[PDB]
Structures are given as structure tokens and as C-alpha cells.
């Protein structure tokens, strides 16, 4: 397992997560969409590592980011409509989505 590659991306992820966490804690919803678009790029880097030497297709690495982008559409959509109700459901799913990648980054299974 290429730990240097995942470590580089993980350090970049932790620092990104740390800078946004400070603002996110305030429920700075308007600012939340700004950082969400920047972090989206970082998933593409981890994807390159997820599609490393495996015994099956690239589908696993592919579906992981696909769900994240599909979430971004409903996320921005709830802002446009002002669906505050949906923001609760969106916030938890965003943190649940970014953490899902960690499982595959650490691989403790």
C-alpha cells in the first residue's frame, strides 16, 4: 500500500478540513458552499490512490466520488430553494461522505 501517496493527500485533507472546521462550527452556511467546492478537488487526488493495484474494476474508486458530486447538486439546490430543513440532512451527509473516504485511506478492514 503506497502510504506516502495517501499520507500526502491525508495531510492536505486534514489541513483543508481544519481550516473549514473553524468556520463550519459557526454554521457559516454561506461560507460552507465555498470550501465544499475547493475540497471537491482533493477527492480526485485520493481517487487516483483508490484505483491502485486491485483485484477488481475501477468502479469502487469511481462510485465513491460519484456519490459526493451527486450530493453537491442536492446541496447547492437546497441553498437556491432555501430548504433549511434539507440543510440538516445535507450537513450530516457531507460529513458522512468525507469520512467514508478515510476508511479506504486507512484500510483497517
Rounded-to-integer distance, Cα 38 and Cα 98, Å: 13
Q: Could you give the angle at which helices 59-81 and 29-50 cross, rounded to 10 degrees?
A: 170
Rounded-to-integer distance, Cα 6 and Cα 54, Å: 16
Closest CA to 60 of 109, 93, 94, 12: 109
Which experimental method was this entry solved with?
Answer: NMR
Taking the alpha carbons of 31, 33, 36, 40 in that order, is the dihedral positive or negative? Answer: negative
Range list of H helices, 1-109: 3-24, 29-50, 59-81, 84-106
Amino acid at each position: 500500500s503506497e502510504f506516502e501517496k495517501l499520507r500526502q493527500t491525508g495531510d492536505e485533507l486534514v489541513q483543508a478540513e481544519q481550516r473549514l472546521r473553524e468556520i463550519f462550527d459557526k454554521g457559516d452556511d454561506d461560507s460552507l458552499e465555498q470550501v465544499l467546492e475547493e475540497i471537491e478537488e482533493l477527492i480526485q487526488k485520493h481517487r487516483q490512490l483508490f484505483d491502485n493495484r486491485q483485484e477488481a474494476a475501477d468502479t469502487e474508486a469511481a462510485k465513491q466520488g460519484d456519490q459526493w458530486v451527486q450530493l453537491k447538486q442536492r446541496f447547492r439546490e437546497a441553498i437556491d430553494k432555501g430548504d433549511k430543513d434539507s440543510l440538516e440532512q445535507l450537513l450530516e451527509e457531507l460529513e458522512q461522505a468525507l469520512q467514508k473516504i478515510r476508511e479506504l485511506a486507512e484500510k483497517k478492514n
